[PDB]
Amino acid sequence: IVEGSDAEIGMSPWQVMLFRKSPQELLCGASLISDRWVLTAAHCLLYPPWDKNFTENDLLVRIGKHSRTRYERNIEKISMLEKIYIHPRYNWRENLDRDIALMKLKKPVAFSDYIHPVCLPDRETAASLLQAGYKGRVTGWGNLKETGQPSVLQVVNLPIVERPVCKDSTRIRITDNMFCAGYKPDEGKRGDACEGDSGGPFVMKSPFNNRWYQMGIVSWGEGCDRDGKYGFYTHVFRLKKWIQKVIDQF
């Protein structure tokens, strides 16, 4: 994360880390949505222009971590995956539309004071909170600045930018299954996700029920914390119908 700070112990309990198995390197961030399901971004697993096509056997997942270095015994859990589910209509050849992925763990994870799942938004939740001006929260162990990796999980609070502002800030076709967030050049504040925070969660606290809802998935962006550039996030709700079918079919 860029212009973010250290997270509190168990501040993002649904926060997941996607690792390559050989060699063991941080790929993306992710999120726990139940006992057996993880939700990252598709480009993390599949990006053919960079010969990226990951099997379940290629990847590893680490849940409950605070310090990327320090391994804490019965706190953090390392799980392997049974199967991966990339969106059938995920457009990598043009704009990273429907940049969503689901990971079924080979064994369910027990919840604790550090491992706990996030809420997926509903009709009303998304319509009411997915509105420009409101601040959401990005989290990850990605680069601290552009081209620099952190020890403790980082956290930034970013406001949702008006769809016409997002559109005019980029050259790429922005679809309803995307939303953007970040501060404007004269807003006097900064922050963004960076290489490594991809697939990670953009959450929000419901003023209605004090529950943390995952509104987005850290998808793409042009650089990191560039003035006049905003972070683009996968519109979780717009794809909840797909998330449901994969969970209910397997």
């Binding site: 501040m11 996030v118 409101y134 609070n157």
Partner: peptide
């Protein structure tokens, strides 16, 4: 089921150092 309720925060009835910023933005 009992999601989005942090065991060390919402369950223990505690606010994280910056969650007010979020709720404040809704005004």
């Amino acid at each position: 089921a009992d999601c989005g309720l942090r065991p060390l925060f919402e369950k223990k009835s505690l606010e994280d150092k910056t969650e007010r910023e979020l709720l404040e933005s809704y005004i």
